[PDB]
Amino acid sequence: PPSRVIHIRKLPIDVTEGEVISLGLPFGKVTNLLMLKGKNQAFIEMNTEEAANTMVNYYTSVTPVLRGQPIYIQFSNH
Amino acid sequence: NQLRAQXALQXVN
Ligand SMILES: [N]
């Protein structure tokens, strides 16, 4: 189901907090963030689930890329 | 830490 928080995998090794935040900015306010640099993943929480919808939809047509490397994004169990 | 999240969250917000 669509949820506020979006799980993110295959992130670069030195990926800055800033960069993961700048992923959902085009679609709304980012309210919270947990990075797992140990598994190269992160979580990102948006104000509205509806922003998290426009998120995944867009990044299903446009590759979600952080500095030349693409990443894999998906909804979560929030 | 949760430190660097929040400061960077705040910069934007
Ligand atoms: N902000």
Closest-CA distance of chain A to residue B8, Å: 6
Sign of the Cα pseudo-torsion (B2, A13, A15, A63, in order): negative
Residue with tokens 């990075």: A35
Nearest chain A residue to B2, by CA: A34
Sign of the Cα pseudo-torsion (A58, A54, A41, A17, in order): positive
CB A41 within 8 A of CB A7: yes
Q: Which H or E run includes A34?
A: strand A30-36
Size of interface A-B (CB pairs under 8 A): 23
Solving technique = X-ray
The full set of domains in chain A, from first to last, is 5-75 (3.30.70.330)
CA angle, residues A60, A18, A50, in degrees to nearest 5: 40
Alpha helical stretches, state H, A1-78: 17-24, 49-61
3-state helix, strand and coil shares in percent for chain B, rounded to the nearest 5: 85, 0, 15
